[PDB]
Design an enzyme around this catalytic site. Structure first.
Site, PDB file in Angstrom:
ATOM      1  N   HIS A 185       0.840  -1.214   0.000  1.00 52.18           N
ATOM      2  CA  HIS A 185       0.000   0.000   0.000  1.00 52.18           C
ATOM      3  C   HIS A 185       0.862   1.246   0.000  1.00 52.18           C
ATOM      4  O   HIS A 185       2.061   1.204   0.237  1.00 52.18           O
ATOM      5  CB  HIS A 185      -0.877   0.004   1.249  1.00 52.18           C
ATOM      6  CG  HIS A 185      -1.799  -1.176   1.385  1.00 52.18           C
ATOM      7  ND1 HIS A 185      -2.951  -1.321   0.643  1.00 52.18           N
ATOM      8  CD2 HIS A 185      -1.705  -2.290   2.167  1.00 52.18           C
ATOM      9  CE1 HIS A 185      -3.534  -2.466   0.985  1.00 52.18           C
ATOM     10  NE2 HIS A 185      -2.787  -3.080   1.902  1.00 52.18           N
ATOM     11  N   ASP A 210      -1.558   8.683  -1.680  1.00 50.38           N
ATOM     12  CA  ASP A 210      -1.515   9.850  -2.571  1.00 50.38           C
ATOM     13  C   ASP A 210      -2.498  10.868  -1.991  1.00 50.38           C
ATOM     14  O   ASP A 210      -3.693  10.595  -1.860  1.00 50.38           O
ATOM     15  CB  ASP A 210      -2.002   9.428  -3.986  1.00 50.38           C
ATOM     16  CG  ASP A 210      -2.206  10.594  -5.021  1.00 50.38           C
ATOM     17  OD1 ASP A 210      -2.327  11.821  -4.761  1.00 50.38           O
ATOM     18  OD2 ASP A 210      -2.312  10.236  -6.239  1.00 50.38           O
ATOM     19  N   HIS A 212      -4.267  14.371  -2.703  1.00 50.11           N
ATOM     20  CA  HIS A 212      -4.538  15.372  -3.742  1.00 50.11           C
ATOM     21  C   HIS A 212      -4.199  16.787  -3.277  1.00 50.11           C
ATOM     22  O   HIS A 212      -4.094  17.708  -4.076  1.00 50.11           O
ATOM     23  CB  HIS A 212      -5.994  15.317  -4.179  1.00 50.11           C
ATOM     24  CG  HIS A 212      -6.373  14.117  -4.990  1.00 50.11           C
ATOM     25  ND1 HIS A 212      -7.601  14.026  -5.599  1.00 50.11           N
ATOM     26  CD2 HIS A 212      -5.682  13.013  -5.364  1.00 50.11           C
ATOM     27  CE1 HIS A 212      -7.665  12.890  -6.282  1.00 50.11           C
ATOM     28  NE2 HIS A 212      -6.511  12.257  -6.174  1.00 50.11           N
ATOM     29  N   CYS A 234      -5.058   5.337  -1.592  1.00 48.96           N
ATOM     30  CA  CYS A 234      -3.961   4.424  -1.923  1.00 48.96           C
ATOM     31  C   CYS A 234      -3.843   4.370  -3.439  1.00 48.96           C
ATOM     32  O   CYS A 234      -4.838   4.524  -4.146  1.00 48.96           O
ATOM     33  CB  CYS A 234      -4.268   3.053  -1.347  1.00 48.96           C
ATOM     34  SG  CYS A 234      -2.990   1.834  -1.496  1.00 48.96           S
ATOM     35  N   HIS A 240      -7.368  -0.971  -5.288  1.00 51.53           N
ATOM     36  CA  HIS A 240      -7.246  -0.485  -3.915  1.00 51.53           C
ATOM     37  C   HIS A 240      -8.266   0.578  -3.584  1.00 51.53           C
ATOM     38  O   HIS A 240      -8.878   0.524  -2.524  1.00 51.53           O
ATOM     39  CB  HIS A 240      -5.830  -0.014  -3.627  1.00 51.53           C
ATOM     40  CG  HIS A 240      -4.864  -1.139  -3.474  1.00 51.53           C
ATOM     41  ND1 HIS A 240      -4.141  -1.342  -2.325  1.00 51.53           N
ATOM     42  CD2 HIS A 240      -4.510  -2.130  -4.328  1.00 51.53           C
ATOM     43  CE1 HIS A 240      -3.377  -2.417  -2.482  1.00 51.53           C
ATOM     44  NE2 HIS A 240      -3.599  -2.929  -3.676  1.00 51.53           N
ATOM     45  N   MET A 280     -10.011   2.134   0.036  1.00 50.78           N
ATOM     46  CA  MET A 280      -8.800   2.739   0.532  1.00 50.78           C
ATOM     47  C   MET A 280      -8.679   4.196   0.088  1.00 50.78           C
ATOM     48  O   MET A 280      -7.847   4.568  -0.721  1.00 50.78           O
ATOM     49  CB  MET A 280      -7.593   1.903   0.139  1.00 50.78           C
ATOM     50  CG  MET A 280      -6.544   1.967   1.172  1.00 50.78           C
ATOM     51  SD  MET A 280      -5.463   0.504   1.128  1.00 50.78           S
ATOM     52  CE  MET A 280      -4.340   1.194   2.329  1.00 50.78           C
ATOM     53  N   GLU A 298     -29.876  22.895  -4.946  1.00 54.20           N
ATOM     54  CA  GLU A 298     -30.699  21.727  -4.638  1.00 54.20           C
ATOM     55  C   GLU A 298     -29.812  20.471  -4.612  1.00 54.20           C
ATOM     56  O   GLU A 298     -29.932  19.656  -3.705  1.00 54.20           O
ATOM     57  CB  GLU A 298     -31.922  21.545  -5.595  1.00 54.20           C
ATOM     58  CG  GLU A 298     -31.623  21.264  -7.068  1.00 54.20           C
ATOM     59  CD  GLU A 298     -32.834  21.349  -7.980  1.00 54.20           C
ATOM     60  OE1 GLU A 298     -33.875  20.699  -7.711  1.00 54.20           O
ATOM     61  OE2 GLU A 298     -32.699  22.071  -8.993  1.00 54.20           O
ATOM     62  N   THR A 299     -28.959  20.341  -5.636  1.00 49.62           N
ATOM     63  CA  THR A 299     -28.125  19.198  -5.892  1.00 49.62           C
ATOM     64  C   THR A 299     -26.857  19.752  -6.505  1.00 49.62           C
ATOM     65  O   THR A 299     -26.911  20.758  -7.170  1.00 49.62           O
ATOM     66  CB  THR A 299     -28.861  18.228  -6.854  1.00 49.62           C
ATOM     67  OG1 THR A 299     -30.148  17.880  -6.308  1.00 49.62           O
ATOM     68  CG2 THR A 299     -28.066  16.987  -7.119  1.00 49.62           C
ATOM     69  N   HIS A 343     -28.320  11.883  -5.687  1.00 50.66           N
ATOM     70  CA  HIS A 343     -29.593  12.043  -6.415  1.00 50.66           C
ATOM     71  C   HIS A 343     -29.648  11.411  -7.795  1.00 50.66           C
ATOM     72  O   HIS A 343     -30.482  11.803  -8.597  1.00 50.66           O
ATOM     73  CB  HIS A 343     -30.107  13.492  -6.389  1.00 50.66           C
ATOM     74  CG  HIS A 343     -31.589  13.616  -6.360  1.00 50.66           C
ATOM     75  ND1 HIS A 343     -32.371  13.251  -7.424  1.00 50.66           N
ATOM     76  CD2 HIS A 343     -32.432  14.111  -5.419  1.00 50.66           C
ATOM     77  CE1 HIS A 343     -33.644  13.506  -7.128  1.00 50.66           C
ATOM     78  NE2 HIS A 343     -33.714  14.020  -5.919  1.00 50.66           N
TER      79      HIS A 343
HETATM   80  O1  NO2 Z   1     -35.986  15.116  -3.109  1.00 54.25           O
HETATM   81  N1  NO2 Z   1     -35.113  14.073  -3.161  1.00 54.25           N
HETATM   82  O2  NO2 Z   1     -35.440  12.996  -3.540  1.00 54.25           O
HETATM   83  O1  NO2 Z   2      -4.144  11.043  -7.318  1.00 56.86           O
HETATM   84  N1  NO2 Z   2      -4.622  10.472  -8.458  1.00 56.86           N
HETATM   85  O2  NO2 Z   2      -4.831   9.306  -8.539  1.00 56.86           O
HETATM   86 CU    CU Z   3      -3.756  -0.051  -0.732  1.00 59.68          CU
HETATM   87 CU    CU Z   4     -35.421  14.673  -4.996  1.00 62.99          CU
HETATM   88 CU    CU Z   5      -6.088  10.517  -7.166  1.00 62.86          CU
END
Ligand code: NO2
Ligand code: NO2
Ligand code: CU
Ligand code: CU
Ligand code: CU
Ligand code: NO2
Ligand code: NO2
Ligand code: NO2
Ligand code: NO2
Ligand code: NO2
Ligand code: NO2
Ligand code: NO2
Ligand code: NO2
Ligand code: NO2
Ligand code: NO2
Ligand code: CU
Ligand code: CU
Ligand code: CU
Lengths: 334, 334, 334
Positions: A89, A92, A94, A130, A139, A144, A273-274, A300
């Site tokens: 393992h 990483d 970001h 990972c 992974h 992970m 909303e979303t 959603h």
């Molecule tokens: O309003 N969400 O399903």
């Molecule tokens: O961090 N990218 O797999």
């Molecule tokens: Cu791993």
């Molecule tokens: Cu909804």
């Molecule tokens: Cu990544």
């Protein structure tokens, strides 16, 4: 500078969806923040049917814990791979710059450990996962992955530059699993990770998850483990998806302020909303509860939510506001 | 306040893609806006092959109609489930706050009706949909969804805060259907909703729609039902997708101003070619036509558009502008 | 105006990921920019297994080349379909206004050519693609797509309106292919395009690509064809996807400034980890390298990247910065 002149603080992580104690506005100068995680390969039951997978975890949980630092702190992670595990393992981040996010520097066989340091130069919420060369998606989709929040030193700000302060924070990690199926549609079972690998790859290549869950299992954030709040409280929900797009929605509420792609130097989107959190991203949504009762927090794509697992609950306590919503005529036969 | 002191206005809805008469800038103070919808379960032919499904509708159409109010109006909906229907239904408004968007308060068996009121506290376009506990995605993906537009009281504004006024508005509801298929790839047929349910769930769990359509059927917004405009007209297209991501594109045009996630307190994105509306969201795009002729309005997964159904047409009348585009040498053999 | 009074400049295109010479800030007034592309239908090997498809290309490559002009220049394209090809083709520019982006005016049988002119009225990066009526997704998903960049006349600007200047530019075209499979999961092979068509449609209708690649093949942007940079250099990566969503991520870096939906009148998103480029869109990300070594540039659906092909490399030369990242304790047994 000399990093050795900086304050050090050690953090003991906590299990998602909870988050370790921290301060939104930095009360010290830049620090080296020390974290430790121990990798655990373990069996996990992921659904009501009792489907059991071989999960790969940071610190025993899916997702891994949320780490919280401030911009231009240094993160120093001790990563331990005990000899009770079987696989190689690494990690990483970001949030980090260089060496594949740390993955090139953190490869640990069972029985080994390593310590990585990086400077958290960009504010936002970020995925970590990972990523061992040649076996990355296996992974990540075995659980992970987690997230790290790098807060601006002066805390969060709205679209006008005024402070936003949350009263509570939760971390929802959403996991797409790909349990291999046979011609009949039945889940296949495997004796070792090596024997599992090719069918795991074939299942991933369908691009069709068998399960999509919050906090590691169908129903994990319901019942006695529902999230909670009170009317009037300001809640930040950090949501990550290391591999696949998701679209969070609070059923009965909104995202008042949303950083859908998670980076705090940008103004938030208002009144959502979303929102779409792309695979490989963490996002954050801030909401002030205005009504009590049960809320569902979902991806959603409602199939993903209600058939595949990507749904949890809030239980909110307080006063009902009949101005905001009321039943005028309750369901009845006329 | 006392809501009983407010003006009431009744609205008779119209069938999509048309939208009931309204004013962009509010000409009255806050009002209670009264709507009525009658649920209709009905057979619908969804493609050129004659595939017929058992659709679940608000007001007889897929999508349900667009409701239009202003910010801080109250929406009062009388929802009727006639005894000619078979199923339990309700309604969840993403515009509303509390009680699962109204779903917890609006459960109606056949032969019942109910009236819900909510305050439309956030400006934007929002999804509404049926959401009966335990059977949510089945109802939504059988067509039981629409949208509501909550206009700012002073109408729409551009990225600089100046007014944007549309001359015409259309509502495009995009529907993903999951018609169950057998091992051969043939659509299966069912005698009752109960007998359909498990195979409907299995089909949904593939996450692969069989059909993706505008206004309820392949080709619904073409031919005699093409959308229309004139060169120079400003058109708002509201687009919803209650369950699955879409990416609208006007072939031959642009989104001059786009609220991709539909919320009007945010500045619009300018000059878009294509925009992503996440599943569970409504978005809105504003365009001023500059050339006549036929345009295709599509989901720009072109497989989804041209093989699965997510394509309609505009027919635009007016002058051709040779400065903007011209054929210099028409196709020929040299 | 009279277009005949404007300067004309001819551009010879170059193969992706490289980009023809241009100036970021316009050194002339508006111009007619002349491009020529010759369509080539050809066999292409797309993966390490030797899977060979019948590709449809602009100018011999997948993607087609990047064209670069400035806002309110005119693009004049001579499109040639040699008699060695078999199919009808055309071109739709998302940058253009009218006539289906030019597609209605550019239909060329084998042995024909055509010249189209359009005014590039909107700044941004845009998709172009073939779009013959009735067969659109088949052409696009056989590789017949590219992009055009319309720079603001005063070059790129940050979120505060100050100049952003790139030192290097690359164009990554990401292609989803749908190679038909039999019941066993084996790739099927075809004798003519006509004999291929129905199975190509069936494969597309699965919405599950068999391959997702950069620059036309698995591994195309690795090894001797890895992208390159030096520490301190500012790099713009233009990324397009004509048919399907993608989510680019630079492993070990960030998008410092990102136009995820590619339109330069909008402020960029800052500090992105991953960004969503919707199908049918081009986007652009600007990054200043701060560490040397190998980076992976991926679609962050990691299955799509590492199993299906959507991954390339940067090789970056320069000084290692131990302040930004360091190994504190290298992997070891304690
Ligand atoms: O309003 N969400 O399903
Ligand atoms: O961090 N990218 O797999
Ligand atoms: Cu791993
Ligand atoms: Cu909804
Ligand atoms: Cu990544
Ligand atoms: O690790 N995924 O929640
Ligand atoms: O819970 N997913 O099959
Ligand atoms: O709600 N009582 O009719
Ligand atoms: O109801 N969907 O358009
Ligand atoms: O340009 N739309 O296919
Ligand atoms: O129209 N969809 O098969
Ligand atoms: O377009 N006439 O050659
Ligand atoms: O043409 N696609 O890179
Ligand atoms: O490289 N894709 O099978
Ligand atoms: O990294 N040397 O222990
Ligand atoms: Cu219903
Ligand atoms: Cu073509
Ligand atoms: Cu297009």
């Amino acid at each position: 500078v000399d990093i050795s002149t900086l304050p050090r603080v050690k953090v003991d992580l906590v299990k998602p969806p909870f988050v370790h104690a921290h301060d939104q506005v930095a009360k010290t100068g830049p620090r080296v923040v020390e974290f430790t995680m121990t990798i655990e390969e373990k069996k996990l039951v992921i659904d009501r049917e009792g489907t059991e997978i071989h999960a790969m975890t940071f610190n025993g949980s899916v997702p891994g814990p949320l780490m919280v630092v401030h911009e231009n702190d240094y993160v120093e992670l001790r990563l331990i791979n005990p000899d009770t595990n079987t696989l190689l393992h690494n990690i990483d981040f970001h949030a980090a710059t260089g060496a594949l996010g740390g993955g090139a520097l953190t490869q640990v066989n069972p029985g080994e450990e390593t310590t990585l340091r990086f400077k958290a130069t960009k504010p936002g919420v970020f995925v970590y996962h990972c990523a061992p060369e040649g076996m990355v998606p296996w992974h990540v989709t075995s659980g992970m992955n987690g997230a790290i929040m790098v807060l601006p030193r002066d805390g969060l700000k709205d679209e006008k530059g005024q402070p936003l302060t949350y009263d509570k924070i939760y971390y929802v990690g959403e996991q797409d699993f790909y349990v291999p199926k046979d011609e009949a549609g039945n889940y296949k079972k495997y004796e070792t990770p090596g024997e599992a690998y090719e069918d795991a790859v074939k299942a991933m290549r369908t691009l069709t998850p068998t399960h999509i869950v919050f906090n590691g299992a169908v129903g994990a954030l319901t019942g006695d483990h529902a999230l909670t709040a009170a009317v009037g409280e300001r809640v930040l929900v950090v949501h990550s998806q290391a591999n696949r797009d998701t679209r969070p929605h609070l059923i009965g509420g909104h995202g008042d302020y949303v950083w859908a792609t998670g980076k705090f130097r940008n103004p938030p989107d208002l009144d959502q909303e979303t929102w779409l959190i792309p695979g490989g991203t963490a996002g954050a949504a801030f909401y002030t509860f205005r009504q009590p009762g049960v809320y569902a927090y979902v991806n959603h794509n409602l199939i993903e939510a209600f058939e595949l697992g990507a749904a949890g609950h809030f239980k909110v306590t307080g006063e009902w506001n009949d101005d905001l919503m009321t039943s005028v005529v309750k369901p009845a036969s006329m």
